[PDB]
Design a protein around this ligand. Sequence first.
Ligand SMILES: CNC(=O)[C@H](Cc1c[nH]cn1)NC(=O)CN(CCCc1ccccc1)CC(=O)O
Ligand SMILES: [Zn+2]
Length: 954
Amino acid sequence: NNPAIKRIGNHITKSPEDKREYRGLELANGIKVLLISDPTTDKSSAALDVHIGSLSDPPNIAGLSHFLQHMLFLGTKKYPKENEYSQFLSEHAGSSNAFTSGEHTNYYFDVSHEHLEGALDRFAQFFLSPLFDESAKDREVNAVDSEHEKNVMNDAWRLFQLEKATGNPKHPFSKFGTGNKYTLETRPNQEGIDVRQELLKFHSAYYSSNLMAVVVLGRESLDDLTNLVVKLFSEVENKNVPLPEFPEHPFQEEHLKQLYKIVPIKDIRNLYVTFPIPDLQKYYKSNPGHYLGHLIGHEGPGSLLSELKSKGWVNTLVGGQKEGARGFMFFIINVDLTEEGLLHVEDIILHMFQYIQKLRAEGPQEWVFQELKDLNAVAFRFKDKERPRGYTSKIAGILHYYPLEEVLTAEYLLEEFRPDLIEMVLDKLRPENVRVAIVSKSFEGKTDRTEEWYGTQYKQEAIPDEVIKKWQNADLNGKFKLPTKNEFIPTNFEILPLEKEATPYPALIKDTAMSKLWFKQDDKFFLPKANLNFEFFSPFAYVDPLHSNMAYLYLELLKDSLNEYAYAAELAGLSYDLQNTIYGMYLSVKGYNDKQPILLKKIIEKMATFEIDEKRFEIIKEAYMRSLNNFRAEQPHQHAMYYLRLLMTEVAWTKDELKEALDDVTLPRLKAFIPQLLSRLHIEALLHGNITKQAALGIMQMVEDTLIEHAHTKPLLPSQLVRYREVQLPDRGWFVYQQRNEVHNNSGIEIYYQTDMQSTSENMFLELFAQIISEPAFNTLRTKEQLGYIVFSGPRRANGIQGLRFIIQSEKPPHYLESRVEAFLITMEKSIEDMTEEAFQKHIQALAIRRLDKPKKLSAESAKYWGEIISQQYNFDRDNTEVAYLKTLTKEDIIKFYKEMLAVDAPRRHKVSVHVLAREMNLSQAPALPQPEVIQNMTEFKRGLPLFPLVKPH
Ligand SMILES: CNC(=O)[C@H](Cc1c[nH]cn1)NC(=O)CN(CCCc1ccccc1)CC(=O)O
Ligand SMILES: [Zn+2]
């Protein structure tokens, strides 16, 4: 035996397709541990989840655990450099993050497989000897203030806290998880709190070993990982902390039968119906709430959503069980509202209860349970291999809930059929404990309350008793039926033998005027799945704002019309994705290959013989108007990025231009557009997965054939296959475009240093430079200078051209952000000069590892190929080519590069900046900048400049 280990679990049940190896165990200090050994893996990973979270904040210091989560990254006793951790990761091809829910704090990272031990050692120190440096705390508190500022004007975050503020304020549920500058500094200072103590106190009280789960994944054997984990983690001290419980629901009697009217930020209409329920988590083997979710949330014929959608009152619905914390859960049903639907909220809920009643009337249904259990068993067997960071983070979390042996299956497999639990949860979905929330702009001015944290305007009301009764006496309604056998359930899982002529990259197997078929049968993953991707080209999908609107509308109407039929396939692991592009349309069909050709044929056939329902047209149109308008409520950085897309692309229709042109969109006009669009096309497809050359040609040909038979599609001409170019910027020039965000009181900035076209050479100069500056940018602009929560840098790539970019969202003005990036950029040339050839070579090696990391799942491989095909570079072997070339570069290559294209006095510096100002408008040396040329009109700017070439295909 071994003193450090309390036990090794028995065999960990995995899918029989999972080649990875697993060992579970419990340390002597009580920490639950999963070990994953994957000798193939390119990146390694570890995560730790602690069963404590914002629900355990001192009442008097809101968001202390979320703050503590930020601080652990910023220095321990053993590795005291503020950024040892994030720099060690950067230089060895890793990344990291954390999050805090009300009951968990979850920390994970990935790294190159050679450096797991180094990564992990630095990591353990978080849980033993964090420094909470006084100077780090002062600074990092602003990052948290930004995190919340971001969220303040977000409609989902406000609704989330508003729920917490209307249950029992005495309950921990009512707490503010995020914290801000106010709750973390201003106010604790006023009240003579030393926050460094309070962080040391909270860390020491709750970061106890008995409350921790670790997962590690690496190339090492299971024995090697064991020794490793034991070594680094046995010294975490066990304080035997009792795990927090919340037996009492935060919605007590007086919180039930309430109605709330709420004003949103975006122009949206929504109804949130919600009942309290007990903790259902222990019933995971039978899962009563999933069963009722499957049903109430169903979207097929017969379903609740269906009648709500035919009465033209709602558009979408979600319902099912919602997590609470240990002790309570909720059951929700929320829908959005047509303008008509808003005036029928009473009737909508009554339909809701008529449906619930139908379920009571029919009793539990084993055949539905069998169906659910079967889908999940299939889902489990053929689960795609996950990226290791996500996987460890996830499993660390759930080690807290399941026996070691079941950690892999517990969330998937079903075992027990429980008509009793089903009937019991069903007894709680009653008018006597309902909550109703309506979110609409029409409550503007009519509100009397304000939510402290986010500022939400709202009104609370008792639901009239006769209203409750009307709901209590819900009749059956003959429009509601249980769903019938799901015919889309796959049964054929045969993995076709690997062909004689199969290749490692996709092959151009068809090159006609109508279509260009790229194909690869799967040589890696061997699951009964495929992806079938299609670009359809029409110059009419974007010839003008009007047309762009129509392509959009057409596609939403089609998706809406297929929804009832398609929902079945989606439960059966077969889904599709269909949207309009600036080039025509896109279509992806993904999942188990068995019934895949059925659904595809149904889609094309529909596309080509489409009949629009006047009622449905009118609603989607209204919903689209709002959507375009709602862009004004998007975040300042998302705005900045948007403007820069509009400014650098040859052709691009502005949200305003679409909004305006959307009124000339009549039903007559739409009916005429469809056959026009569908009459001349080109198709470029990539077919990839468990399929053969001959089946692939058949599928492609069936698509074409359907379009001819029904829309008379003829091929498009080679010269009409027009791709849009990027604006070419003048050597030494600098432009600024300035706009205002009228909703958020932060500002946004995008700075673009354009370089040259994409070419093996020019590609890797940019990438290495980005790699070297990646963490220092984060570390300088955020950690040190605390300019904002959002601080991004990296390559930008569009229409075959490229360049470096910075994105910041900040409280300080853009002219200010400009200058500190510039400051930073000098710091950088200064660093490349001072760095060891070996430091230089580490960065080369990290980019190397990132670039070469093998896809772990089909979808991921497809994506890499598709990027090659949509960009028309067709460079399928690019990763080996570009990497070979990378290893050839030297410090002087990169300085020359920075001196030519990037330094402030660079002979070919091409700088464009988007400044997005807020609602309302020591440190390194910043260089003196030129008078920028302020862009007045986006069209003029474009007319007056060269356009770039397009990239030659490989
Ligand atoms: C398993 N149950 C079901 O089948 C249905 C499916 C459905 C589709 N359309 C309609 N209903 N239920 C659901 O999907 C929804 N609920 C709640 C979401 C709670 C949430 C809120 C914000 C942020 C993170 C999660 C469960 C879930 O997410 O699985
Ligand atoms: Zn955070």
